[PDB]
Design a protein around this ligand. Structure first.
Ligand SMILES: CCCCCCCCCCCCCCCCCC(=O)OC[C@H](COP(=O)([O-])OCC(O)COP(=O)([O-])OC[C@@H](COC(=O)CCCCCCCCCCCCCCCCC)OC(=O)CCCCCCCCCCCCCCCCC)OC(=O)CCCCCCCCCCCCCCCCC
Ligand SMILES: CCCCCCCCCCCCCCCCCC(=O)OC[C@H](COP(=O)([O-])OCC(O)COP(=O)([O-])OC[C@@H](COC(=O)CCCCCCCCCCCCCCCCC)OC(=O)CCCCCCCCCCCCCCCCC)OC(=O)CCCCCCCCCCCCCCCCC
Ligand SMILES: CCCCCCCCCCCCCCCCCC(=O)OC[C@H](COP(=O)([O-])OCC(O)COP(=O)([O-])OC[C@@H](COC(=O)CCCCCCCCCCCCCCCCC)OC(=O)CCCCCCCCCCCCCCCCC)OC(=O)CCCCCCCCCCCCCCCCC
Ligand SMILES: CCCCCCCCCCCCCCCCCC(=O)OC[C@H](COP(=O)([O-])OCC[N+](C)(C)C)OC(=O)CCCCCCCCCCCCCCCCC
Ligand SMILES: CCCCCCCC/C=C\CCCCCCCC(=O)OC[C@H](COP(=O)(O)OCCN)OC(=O)CCCCCCC/C=C\CCCCCCCC
Ligand code: HEC
Ligand code: HEM
Ligand code: HEM
Ligand code: HEM
Ligand code: HEM
Ligand SMILES: COC1=C(OC)C(=O)C(CC=C(C)C)=C(C)C1=O
Lengths: 92, 92, 55, 354, 95, 242, 117, 354
């Protein structure tokens, strides 16, 4: 019925400062999220190894069956939880 | 000791606690003497019509200033994020 | 003691006033109804002899 | 009626040894009045034509309409919390052994409440309510032609809303009348105490019990005001803010939290009617839990181990209901239902002598 | 109402209509009692809450500990079900 | 199988008890909605007058509405005409019916974004996550033309093209236009659109909650007082103490 | 646990019986005054302690709470009730309904049902 | 409640000398219940968003809906006929001299009925109804801003219909409660007889008075069934079946026949407020017609010449209301109002001694 659940501000870790997005060699600002992708992937390495393993197991199957969506959704949920903790600090 | 059994009994520290009855001690009397010097009982409370007038008039003025205080609290917490705090610049 | 019982009455009566006053306020013409009701008409651009219609 | 009020409020004597669990009933009565008043006021700005837009028009155009909308939704959650907690109390202190008439009057109000709530969420014209009445009406699909009579068409439509709305308007007033029958038996058949016996420790109600009952209600108000304005707990499913499309099925067709114990029963049992029937058993067997006993005792103030396992069974079934219909949850949930029957049998069975 | 012996009244003055329920809760006091008390205006009104605080919470937690074993069996079952659901989903799907 | 992946818990300003909707972000959000989302979605229940003196000044809202053309009528000859928009008009809708919209999105229907900020589990977090949740398909998943992978959409495959690209628009205030900013801003705006009375609700709630605490203390002192009479009495049978 | 609870309240097991039970009421009619006086005082002390969240001092807890002091009078009451049942209630009697403040369906107290108000 | 029913229906003693004019009240109670039931049932099929199209859908699509529509309209006419005849009776036998409390309770129900009927007319959503309320609401146009609070807009719209509908749904249930207060005083303060004194000729109600009261109600039913199915008397104006057009004014903006007395009063007096005020006088002065008397007599069973001229004044004013505002009718009607003031002064004034 409502968009969010209310919380004390001490439970809401809002960015206390703002770091402007880095500028590219061309001069276009680079997305803070794209820069945070590798760092958050490393924090979720355990799930990424599970996904990478699946990819190689489905690669062997000589039939066309096999997907690795289940393990990708767990990795993605993990990488995204990491991003949420630090992304708004680079956004106005 | 005996917690969690049919032999449960009050520990010595709970029993020493209940041995301190504080009889004759009154450490908060200063507050009542001082409140009584405001003469609120002789002026408002004692008479029913005046007691009603204290609740009404005191609720009219209390409600307004309570709102006033928490409006200022809000204007301060959200400084720079309110519409009034950020006049809009029309595009050229 | 009578300050405490009175403060229960002071705050209660404020909540009652606010409740009653806000319920009756909802019967006032709504925000959409007020906006349509009063209409400001810009007379700039009309030419002498022209007739326009405003709903 | 002033003398009646004085006899039932001012000179009404109650034991001085009661806990704050004897204040739950006062709260139900107060929160019930609030739900009727807010309901009548909301109807002043909305009817049955299109609830989806009507709720939007209340929250955006009416002055302080948001208060009315959220109070009426959240105070329902509150009604069902206090009622369900009032039953848990009555089970713990076995207040049905000698005051069955009070228990019977209460159960009648429980039945009425379970119909009032279900139909209120279809008044919002939301997806999750559209497809949840379409799935509960099809449980009486066996009785020939009865679905058509109730629905008024071959599919749920505005016709179905125009009629359920009248039941939602009127049934609450009848509930208030049964509340009088309930308070009548309570005052004649004296209330039970925290102690199993009857003791000469009674004190008048207005000067003592009402002051304490108000401390309780104001405590709950502090918490209800926080939920009312900040949604600290998710008590309303978000999928009721999706416009009704009769072609697409919602992600999950679940009721509101206070029907998840009987939704799970219906999703766990393999035959549709068996489920319906086990939902009757839940609301009916609890009305005869002292009838077969033969000892001069009320089975009160023991460790209440059977009671604790029953209260947890309710909570655990509500959890299974939130979960999707995965097989592993279904198997475990069927065991929880088998366990409830055995616990219920333990309450019902009289004891042989060594 | 109370037992018919308890509600039996010694006085012949009629029961007031506003006190019907009050006198249906009468008790026949055996042997007598000497009840005493003091007005709250001449007493400490919050001390007893503090004085009884430790014992109240001790005797509450000792009784509520009866449910510990039941609580642990139910939580063990909750964990077993959760893991069973996860392994079953990973087995049905998840190549 | 499991339900769609739960959206992360983003630290929006308005999530705290005493915090408001950040108007600067809501203004940028309107720009993102008008220049990106509006091509396919409609906000039927959002009117221009809702933004007056709340997001934009009255004259500015007039200019925005006047930019669009609406179909009004009939005239005295029974015909329908086209006029510039006004403060009383709803936000423009890209397609005339749901069947026209479906025909322009490979059968998929762009949902109305009026209450979408609260129509999905996660609420505002679901909008932010979805718009920033497009990824390369998982291994073994192959998507047809017009189908894109997104971790938060139920199923994984969404018919919406990735909508936010860096430099798509220029914010009037100069804020750097990056995909994650546009997401944070359009999520903020759609949250406001769902319940424009959010700030009044929370300012009046603050005054009610704090007052209720003072009320609790008064009824507590009262309760403690009257019950002292009862909880300190002494009943004796063969004893007497004064 | 039950013995401990009785000892904490300072009451006997037979004190715990509720007089809403008709056999208990009929027995309490005929208990001697000596038993009756001590029974009331124990029950009064128990309710005071329970209400004030206190327990009987251990100095007073060394007693056997399962002494069946009510047994003689329970048995007499059951005998009296069984005679009345067999000699006076062997048939579902017919009586004029809702007259004299009673439903006519059997109860003997006036204004003791909702429909008899 | 069974004992209460037996005390107030089965062992209730009433004088055996009463006429059939003492059965009017029984009929009001029965026809009132019928109006509530039919109203609730009609609500099951009615959409208050457009009640013009809603009434058509009831009479053409609902099975036996025509019965519900015409009963609810015609039974209103019947309610007002029986009520107005119940007052005429009470005036003739001066049943307000010693039973004023009964008279006061009745007048409260009369006030409530006057509000219920008017708002029900507007739910029809036809030309006459729309323009009629638009005229009445503009009598309180002096009180600043109150028209806007009642209407909810600057002109009558569905917004006004959605709020008045709630008053029309709820106010009848309150009327039924005041009917209990009315029957309470009647049973305590014994009814008046055809003779001025009090005599020991009373007989129980169920075995005699109810049989006679049913012969009366069945007589009225025969006549009401003929009107219900054949419209022997025009009791509903035809211009309420014209779709509302705010631009065109109806041929004549008049109320239902049972509001024509007060419509005429308002169309005869030259100042709008004077007219409103003379309507207040009509429904207030009649509550003090015995207060200033000083003789030990109830002024009963005389030739009642003043009474006859009052009853005719009512009928004649209803006629003037039907007639268009021809000047001649206004002059004659102003004389009829002056005459009514004089007749009412005759009732009020105590007499001096020769
Ligand atoms: C007689 C004349 C009277 C004149 C009166 C004028 C004042 C007045 O009324 O103005 C209002 C006006 C303010 O009006 P306002 O702004 O609307 O009021 C404030 C808000 O309403 C308040 O804000 P809000 O309404 O937005 O807030 C919500 C509201 C309401 O909220 C709700 O109602 C919300 C819920 C709604 C629910 C809706 C659905 C309900 C459904 C049914 C529910 C059933 C239950 O609730 C509250 O705010 C709660 C307040 C609670 C009390 C707060 C204070 C607590 C104090 C605690 C003290 C104790 C502790 C002390 C500790 C000390 C430690 C040292 O007053 C003022 O401006 C204040 C100053 C007034 C000065 C008056 C001077 C008079 C001078 C007269 C001169 C005459 C001269 C004559 C000359 C010629 C002679 C011949
Ligand atoms: C586990 C415990 C299970 C038994 C609970 C008690 C049952 C009982 O007999 O109470 C019935 C109670 C009667 O109790 P009673 O013994 O007669 O006394 C009542 C009072 O004397 C009436 O007193 P009054 O008249 O003065 O009224 C005031 C009363 C009004 O309220 C009541 O009447 C209370 C009713 C029972 C509430 C039980 C709440 C237990 C909460 C435990 C929380 C643990 C958190 C651990 C967090 C760890 C984090 C790492 O409030 C209280 O007495 C509050 C007392 C304290 C409550 C608990 C506070 C826990 C604080 C923990 C702090 C930990 C700090 C760690 C720091 C570490 C630093 C390094 O009423 C009923 O019969 C029904 C009441 C309605 C609720 C029934 C719920 C039953 C099911 C509980 C499920 C629990 C969750 C699921 C567990 C299993 C999962 C698989
Ligand atoms: C969609 C949802 C729908 C929901 C629907 C829900 C429907 C619920 C219906 C509930 C009905 C409850 C009825 C309770 C009656 C209580 C009577 C009473 O006080 O009896 C005391 C009475 C005391 O016992 P007793 O002393 O042996 O009997 C004394 C009486 O003489 C014993 O009576 P009696 O022999 O003198 O008379 C027997 C019978 C005989 O009645 C007749 O012969 C007259 C029947 C008239 C029928 C109505 C005609 C209406 C015509 C309408 C025309 C069109 C209008 C448009 O009359 C009565 O029972 C009294 C009827 C009073 C009717 C007043 C209103 C009329 C309208 O009986 C009891 O207390 C035991 C039985 C209690 C009831 C079971
Ligand atoms: C979800 C629903 C909405 C929730 C939010 C809104 C809630 C609104 C609730 C309003 C309750 C209002 C109660 C007002 C009571 C005012 C009187 C009162 O009790 O004061 C104490 C007083 C009692 O004071 P007292 O009992 O100390 O009397 C002493 C009197 N003197 C000092 C003169 C000797 O009560 C009254 O005045 C009588 C009426 C009660
Ligand atoms: C008990 C508290 C219940 C919840 C109250 C509540 O929601 O308070 C709102 C608000 C919290 O806002 P945040 O956004 O978390 O701000 C953090 C710092 N800027 O609380 C406050 O303003 C302060 C706490 C409340 C003080 C109340 C004082 C008055 C009552 C006194 C009673 C004695
Ligand atoms: C501007 C930034 C936006 C925003 C905020 C959203 N969209 Fe789209 N969208 C499009 C289509 C075809 C669909 C339906 C696809 C289907 O589900 O198969 C959607 C869906 C959404 C949603 C709802 C997701 C849900 O689970 O239903 C939301 C919240 C949403 N969108 C937001 C198509 C488009 C476009 C067509 C090219 C464009 C441009 C956008 N969307 C842009 C936006
Ligand atoms: C609309 C919901 C109901 C309301 C308004 C309500 C109200 C109350 C009230 C005011 C009390 C007396 C105060 C108390 O001791 O707390 C009470 C007692 C009681 N209620 Fe309810 N009740 C409701 C639901 C129920 C239900 C569903 C049941 C049965 C499962 C029930 C059974 C009882 C019993 C047995 C008692 C007596 C408790 C004791 O012996 O003191 N009530 N109720
Ligand atoms: C036992 C009392 C009642 C309960 C438990 C109940 C329950 C609820 C519920 C759960 C809702 C859905 C809220 C939402 O959409 O999420 C609802 C809606 C509604 N109720 Fe009630 N209700 C009660 C009595 C009443 C009464 C007496 C009225 C007045 C006639 C009323 C009027 C309404 C209206 C108009 C709606 C639709 C608007 C809405 O969605 O908020 N209710 N009700
Ligand atoms: C003192 C009792 C009542 C009277 C005198 C009264 C009067 C009337 C009147 C005169 C009409 C207009 C009929 C027509 O359009 O010509 C009307 C309409 C209506 N009334 Fe009532 N009414 C009563 C109680 C009720 C009740 C309790 C309900 C149920 C909630 C109800 C529901 C309706 C509805 C839905 C309409 C509109 C449909 C219609 O036009 O027939 N009424 N009423
Ligand atoms: C909703 C409309 C009302 C109903 C249901 C109603 C009902 C009844 C009933 C059942 C009776 C007793 C039987 C009788 O003698 O006929 C009665 C008596 C009476 N009513 Fe009403 N009445 C209504 C309107 C009024 C009004 C408007 C007045 C006052 C102008 C009034 C004044 C009286 C009086 C004075 C009596 C006593 C007559 C006598 O002394 O016996 N009633 N009424
Ligand atoms: C959508 O609303 C509801 C359901 O949807 C599935 C329910 O299951 C139930 C439970 C139904 C039964 C037959 C036990 C209710 C009451 C409900 O409100």
């Amino acid at each position: 019925a409502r968009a969010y659940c209310g919380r004390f501000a001490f439970m809401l870790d809002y960015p206390k400062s703002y770091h402007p997005p880095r500028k590219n060699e061309d001069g276009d600002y680079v997305d803070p999220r794209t820069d945070m992708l590798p760092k958050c992937a490393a924090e979720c390495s355990e799930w990424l190894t599970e996904y990478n393993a699946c990819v190689q197991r489905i690669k062997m199957r000589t039939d066309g069956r096999g997907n690795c969506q289940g393990q990708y959704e767990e990795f993605a949920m993990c990488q995204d939880h990491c991003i949420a903790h630090e992304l708004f600090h680079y956004l106005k | 000791s005996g917690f969690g059994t049919s032999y449960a009994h009050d520990p010595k520290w709970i029993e020493d606690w209940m041995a301190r009855k504080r009889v004759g001690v009154d450490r908060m009397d200063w507050f009542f003497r001082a409140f009584n010097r405001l003469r609120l009982y002789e002026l408002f409370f004692k008479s029913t019509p005046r007691f009603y007038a204290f609740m009404v008039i005191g609720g009219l003025l209390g409600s307004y200033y309570w709102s006033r205080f928490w409006e200022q609290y809000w204007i301060r917490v959200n400084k720079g994020r309110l519409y009034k705090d950020v006049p809009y610049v029309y595009p050229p | 003691h009578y300050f405490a019982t009175g403060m229960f009455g002071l705050i209660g009566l404020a909540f009652l006033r606010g409740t009653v006053v806000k319920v009756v306020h909802g019967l006032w013409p709504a925000r959409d109804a007020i906006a349509a009701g009063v209409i400001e008409v810009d007379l700039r651009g009309i030419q002498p002899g022209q007739n326009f219609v405003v709903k | 009626f002033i003398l009646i009020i004085k006899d039932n409020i001012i000179l009404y004597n109650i034991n001085d040894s009661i806990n704050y669990l004897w204040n739950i009933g006062y709260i139900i009565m107060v929160v019930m009045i609030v739900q009727v008043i807010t309901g009548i006021i909301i109807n002043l700005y909305m009817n049955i034509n299109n609830g989806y837009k009507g709720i939007i028009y209340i929250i955006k155009e009416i002055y302080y309409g948001y208060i009315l909308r959220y109070i009426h939704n959240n105070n329902s959650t509150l009604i069902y919390v206090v009622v369900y907690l009032h039953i848990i109390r009555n089970l713990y202190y076995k207040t049905y052994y000698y005051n069955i008439l009070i228990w019977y009057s209460g159960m009648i109000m429980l039945y009425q409440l379970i119909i009032i709530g279900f139909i209120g969420y279809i008044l919002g014209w939301g997806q999750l309510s559209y497809w949840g009445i379409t799935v509960i009406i099809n449980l009486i699909s066996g009785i020939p032609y009865l679905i058509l009579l109730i629905s008024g068409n071959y599919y749920i439509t505005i016709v179905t809303i125009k009629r359920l709305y009248i039941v939602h308007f009127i049934l609450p007033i009848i509930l208030i009348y049964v509340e009088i029958i309930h308070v009548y038996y309570i005052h004649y058949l004296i209330n039970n105490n925290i102690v199993e016996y009857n003791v000469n420790n009674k004190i008048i109600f207005n000067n003592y019990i009402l002051v304490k009952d108000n401390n309780g209600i104001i405590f709950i108000l502090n918490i209800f005001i926080l939920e009312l304005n900040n949604n600290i707990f998710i008590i309303a499913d978000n999928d009721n803010l999706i416009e009704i499309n009769i072609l697409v099925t919602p992600i999950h067709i679940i009721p509101e939290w206070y029907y998840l114990y009987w939704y799970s029963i219906l999703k766990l049992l393999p035959n549709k009617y068996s489920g319906l029937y086990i939902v009757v058993n839940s609301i009916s067997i609890i009305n005869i839990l002292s009838e077969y006993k033969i000892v001069i005792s009320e089975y009160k103030n023991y460790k209440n181990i059977i009671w604790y396992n029953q209260i947890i069974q309710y909570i655990s079934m509500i959890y299974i209901g939130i979960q999707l219909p995965i097989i592993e949850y279904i198997n475990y949930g069927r065991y929880i239902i088998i366990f409830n029957i055995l616990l219920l049998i333990m309450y019902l069975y009289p004891k042989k002598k060594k | 109402p109370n037992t018919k012996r308890d509600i039996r009244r010694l006085g012949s003055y009629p029961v007031p209509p506003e006190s019907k329920n009050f006198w249906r809760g009468r008790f026949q006091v055996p042997g007598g009692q000497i009840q005493q008390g003091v007005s709250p205006m001449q007493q400490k009104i919050f001390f007893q809450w503090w004085w009884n605080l430790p014992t109240r919470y001790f005797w509450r937690f000792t009784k509520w500990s009866d449910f510990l074993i039941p609580s642990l069996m139910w939580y063990t079952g909750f964990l077993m079900c959760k893991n069973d659901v996860e392994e079953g989903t990973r087995s049905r799907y998840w190549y | 199988e499991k339900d769609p992946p739960s959206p992360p818990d983003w630290p929006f300003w308005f999530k705290a008890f005493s915090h408001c909707h950040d108007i600067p972000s809501c203004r940028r959000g309107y720009e993102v909605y008008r220049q990106v989302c509006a091509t396919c979605h409609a906000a039927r229940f959002v009117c221009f007058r809702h933004m007056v003196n709340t997001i934009y000044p009255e004259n500015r809202v007039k200019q925005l509405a006047a930019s669009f053309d609406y179909e009004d009528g009939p005239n005295d000859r029974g015909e329908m005409f086209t006029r510039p928009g006004n403060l009383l008009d709803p936000f423009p809708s890209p397609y005339p019916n749901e069947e026209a919209a479906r025909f322009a999105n490979q059968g998929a229907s762009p949902p109305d974004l009026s209450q979408q900020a609260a129509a999905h589990h996660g609420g505002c977090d679901y909008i932010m996550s979805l718009l920033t949740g497009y990824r390369d398909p998982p291994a073994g998943v192959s998507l047809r033309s017009g189908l894109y992978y997104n971790t938060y959409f139920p199923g994984g495959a969404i018919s919406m093209p990735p909508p936010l690209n860096d430099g798509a628009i220029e914010y009037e205030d100069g804020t750097p236009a990056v995909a994650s900013q546009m997401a944070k801003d359009v999520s903020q705006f759609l949250t406001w659109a769902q319940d424009p009375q959010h700030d009044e609700r929370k300012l009046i709630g603050l005054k009610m909650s704090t007052a209720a605490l003072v009320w609790l203390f008064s009824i507590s002192v009262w309760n403690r007082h009257v019950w002292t009479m009862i909880k300190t009495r002494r009943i004796d049978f063969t004893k007497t103490v004064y | 646990a039950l013995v401990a609870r009785y000892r904490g309240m300072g009451i006997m097991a037979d004190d715990a019986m509720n007089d809403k039970d008709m056999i208990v009421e009929r027995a309490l009619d005929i208990i001697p005054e000596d038993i009756r006086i001590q029974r009331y005082r124990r029950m009064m002390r128990g309710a005071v302690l329970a209400g004030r969240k206190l327990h009987l001092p251990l100095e007073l807890q060394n007693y056997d709470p399962m002494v069946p002091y009510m047994a003689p009078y329970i048995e007499e009451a059951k005998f009296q009730m069984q005679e009345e049942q067999e000699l006076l209630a062997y048939h579902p009697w017919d009586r004029r309904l809702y007259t004299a403040g009673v439903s006519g369906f059997g109860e003997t107290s006036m204004h003791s049902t909702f429909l008899t108000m």
